[PDB]
Amino acid sequence: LGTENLYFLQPRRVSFRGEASETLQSPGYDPSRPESFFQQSFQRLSRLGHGSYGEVFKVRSKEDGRLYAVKRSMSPFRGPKDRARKLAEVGSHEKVGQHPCCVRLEQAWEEGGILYLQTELCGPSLQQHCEAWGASLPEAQVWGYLRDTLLALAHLHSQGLVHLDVKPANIFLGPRGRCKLGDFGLLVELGTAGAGEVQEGDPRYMAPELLQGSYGTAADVFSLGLTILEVACNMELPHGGEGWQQLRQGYLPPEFTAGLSSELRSVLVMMLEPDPKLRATAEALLALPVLRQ
Ligand SMILES: C=CCn1c(=O)c2cnc(Nc3ccc(N4CCN(C)CC4)cc3)nc2n1-c1cccc(C(C)(C)O)n1
């Protein structure tokens, strides 16, 4: 909080469910050496992605020799609110817990005002995959991605959690056609911190009701609806303007969606229902014969 007297450091494990072992240890790591825990405890193999948040690296852990993704924040915390905001991702990630369609958090720690998030290394995001594909993804695969991500959303929504930033860039491929939802930085728990507390996801995938500060689990279904549209049709979604409004008026452009099967188009229509009270739930979608087993 910005009105409290906590205004104005070596590694410390971040957890909202752990033990007195806030101290980290690892092969390769000596606290008395000047290098950070991240530098000492991991082989840095490549940079998976980057942005205003910082960077994500593919790493090999010196602890177990396994591969992971580590997201490192851009610079030291601006202050307590900045810190609480970034640390909330860890808490979010933990409330999800272990679900086969959600990216697992291995561990998290802060050092020198920098936050590090270590997660299981999955395959490329759907966005990266579509870019490498250079075209529409086959529907056979898309049905699989839709179902997995619906299972993740069903999980989140059961606990009154809303992701609020579902998009191709944070659904990651698994082996043999599976995929996992990740990037839980914007996730909110409904009815917790009621005075707050949303920031807004990517405008391309934003549910229309959010413009009016009205949010609920339904917003995630709409976001996924547009996610699947983009990857299934190889369609660039608008950030705004006439096209943005049209996609939130139940309109599906023929010049990109003519190649959809009737069954998939039918499912997208339910997900892109402008009125969140009529929009299908993830549980209801999963109950349809076309999305079971
Ligand atoms: C907390 C970190 C978020 N995050 C994960 O949790 C995570 C897990 N697995 C992966 N895997 C992954 C594997 C390969 C690739 N690429 C292959 C190499 N290309 C040049 C780029 C694409 C790419 C990824 N990637 C993962 N993450 C990741 C990696 C890059 C970018 C982003 C965001 C969502 C922040 O944009 N997230």
UniProtKB/Swiss-Prot annotation:
Keyword Endoplasmic reticulum (UniProt): yes
Membrane topology classification: Peripheral membrane protein
GO BP: G2/M transition of mitotic cell cycle; meiotic cell cycle; mitotic cell cycle; negative regulation of G2/M transition of mitotic cell cycle; negative regulation of G2/MI transition of meiotic cell cycle; regulation of cyclin-dependent protein serine/threonine kinase activity; regulation of mitotic nuclear division
Residues annotated as domain Protein kinase: 42-291
Record key words, sorted: Acetylation, ATP-binding, Cell cycle, Endoplasmic reticulum, Golgi apparatus, Kinase, Magnesium, Membrane, Metal-binding, Nucleotide-binding, Phosphoprotein, Serine/threonine-protein kinase, Transferase
Record-annotated active site: D165
UniProt PTM: Autophosphorylated. Phosphorylated by CDC2-CCNB1 complexes on undefined serine and threonine residues. The phosphorylation by CDC2-CCNB1 complexes may inhibit the catalytic activity.
Protein residues bound to Mg(2+) 1: N170, D183
Signal peptide region: none
Principal subcellular localisation of the protein: endoplasmic reticulum
Enzyme class, broadest EC rank: transferase
Family: Belongs to the protein kinase superfamily. Ser/Thr protein kinase family. WEE1 subfamily.
Entry function: Acts as a negative regulator of entry into mitosis (G2 to M transition) by phosphorylation of the CDK1 kinase specifically when CDK1 is complexed to cyclins. Mediates phosphorylation of CDK1 predominantly on 'Thr-14'. Also involved in Golgi fragmentation. May be involved in phosphorylation of CDK1 on 'Tyr-15' to a lesser degree, however tyrosine kinase activity is unclear and may be indirect.
Protein name (database record): Membrane-associated tyrosine- and threonine-specific cdc2-inhibitory kinase
Organism listed in the record: Homo sapiens
Residue range from the parent sequence: 77 to 361 of 499
